[PDB]
Design a protein around this ligand. Structure first.
Ligand code: MG
Ligand code: MG
Ligand code: MG
Ligand code: MG
Ligand code: MG
Ligand code: MG
Lengths: 63, 131, 53
RNA sequence: AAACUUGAGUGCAGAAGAGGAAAGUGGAAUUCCAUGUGUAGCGGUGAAAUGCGCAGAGAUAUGGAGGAACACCAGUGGCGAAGGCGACUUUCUGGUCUGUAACUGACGCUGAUGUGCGAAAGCGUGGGGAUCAAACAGGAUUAGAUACCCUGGUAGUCCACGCCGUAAACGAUGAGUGCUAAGUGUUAGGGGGCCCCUUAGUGCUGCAGCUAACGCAUUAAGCACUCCGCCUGGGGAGUACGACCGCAAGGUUGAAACUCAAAGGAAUUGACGGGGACCCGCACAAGCGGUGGAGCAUGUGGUUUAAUUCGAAGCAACGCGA
RNA sequence: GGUAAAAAUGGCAA
């Protein structure tokens, strides 16, 4: 697949940007693997810290 | 780090010769140029070119391969080493492959072959054997 | 949560339920943590299973 | 003695990271405790039982307490000298890579003795204790079962500060440097037109060369030079003694008498397996009729005898030579 | 996911 962040020229992921993050999480709230999404290695790391930060602030669910 | 530039030169020649490369390039030094000149003079190598580089210079050696791709240089060996220096007297000068090969000797009369050393009756450090 | 659709069989709903459970992978997780596997063993299983994948 | 910039550093501009230390903040789950609903089991195994429950268990709902570990992400992915390091946040702090070419100008490499770090178990002092779990106790299995399996369960597992100093601490591969076909994936960059080139890692495949063979192969076990550590048949023995270190456990160093002609590595052909695949055969299954029990015939063993002639001995001797 | 449980021993030569 294609990396969204590379394609759309997004270099920073905000944990506060819930709408973006919801696309990269499953229906159970599980973080999606980068194979399925097509996210790059560098951005899988960025996104994932953001999801964990968002879950801390109850913007996104743990489950 | 690099400890024996001469030994490196001979290994580069050995490695390129094994794979039958036409030419090889190495960092230059006065001793390495002299060794190269003897090899051309003795017919082991075709040609030696020197290129100024603003560092230490570059030597380009062209290797000789006989008909049927037979290699003119069969082997090279470093004799005197940084770990153990080897010297010989003119009387004791070694013959390599019973005169079929050569020994490169550093003498007060310059870097020369074993034959010249016996002729001039001057001994010195045995740099390498080439056969 | 699978919810039975209007004019849909409970058995048909059961098919949907089974598939959702499979995607969740809750069954997969349960089996892994039945017995303790030493740290080195866990790492090996992760690698070779990925090698299969 | 005087130069030089290629090695090695420094500056400058970028890059990624579970590198380390200390605070703080989460969510899932386990255990326990408290109540509500509710009922005759639950739990466990090959099968059981011990156990738990009927003094209301288990289950279900809600609340509280506490400890430990951080699903997904997650990848021959990343980082670190090694041991190791995986929730998130902040503070302090180490290293590495790319580009550039300001600067310094061989300032380097290795490294005995030293000196530090060093999984796990263990030890000391204090704290903590959810889970798991040596010892230990039941239950079971068994010829026995000081085990495997089951129900429990203490140290320990956790934290702090000291000690210990060892692991198949492994890539069973010391460090440095250069050189030697390719193909393909991936991590962090750089450059030029998705493609090409390039730097440093990390995998797979594969020449030359190497190797006893297996294999290794620019991440060499190839070709070379420097320095260090280490080996010289097996056992006795990593034992004894001495020394040093340790609270202890032990660690480090480390023989000999005596004894043997072998120990070993790799590969090959077989055989075998409570290994696998695929196939058969009255092998089993599905059936029918028997033998083993009775009387008798006959062979054999044994015993007996003057002699009980000799031969056959699991299947493949025993109504067999006859 | 499984899994049936138990399942000991056998002189050195040639
Ligand atoms: Mg410990
Ligand atoms: Mg137990
Ligand atoms: Mg050791
Ligand atoms: Mg590479
Ligand atoms: Mg009868
Ligand atoms: Mg036997």
């Amino acid at each position: 697949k294609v990396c969204y962040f590379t394609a759309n020229g997004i270099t920073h992921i905000d944990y506060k940007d819930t709408e973006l993050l919801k696309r990269f999480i499953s229906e159970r709230g599980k973080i999606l693997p980068r194979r399925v999404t097509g996210t790059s290695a560098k951005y899988q790391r960025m996104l994932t810290t953001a999801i964990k930060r968002s879950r801390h602030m109850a913007l996104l669910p743990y489950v | 780090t690099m400890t024996d530039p001469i030994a490196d030169m001979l290994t580069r020649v050995r490695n390129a010769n094994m794979v039958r490369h036409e030419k090889l390039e190495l960092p230059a030094s006065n001793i390495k140029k002299e060794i190269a000149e003897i090899l051309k003079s003795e017919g082991f190598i075709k040609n030696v070119e020197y290129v100024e580089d603003d560092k230490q210079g570059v030597l380009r050696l062209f290797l000789k391969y006989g008909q049927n791709d037979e290699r003119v240089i069969t082997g090279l060996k470093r004799i005197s080493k940084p770990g153990l220096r080897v010297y010989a007297k003119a009387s004791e000068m070694p013959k390599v492959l019973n005169g079929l090969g050569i020994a490169l000797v550093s003498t007060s009369e310059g870097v020369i072959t074993d034959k010249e050393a016996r002729k001039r009756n001057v001994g010195g450090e045995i740099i390498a054997y080439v056969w | 949560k699978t919810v039975v659709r209007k004019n849909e069989s409970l058995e048909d709903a059961l098919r949907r339920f089974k598939r959702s459970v499979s995607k969740s992978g809750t069954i997969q997780e349960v089996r892994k943590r039945e017995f303790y596997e030493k740290p080195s063993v866990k790492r090996k299983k992760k690698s070779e299973a990925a090698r299969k994948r």
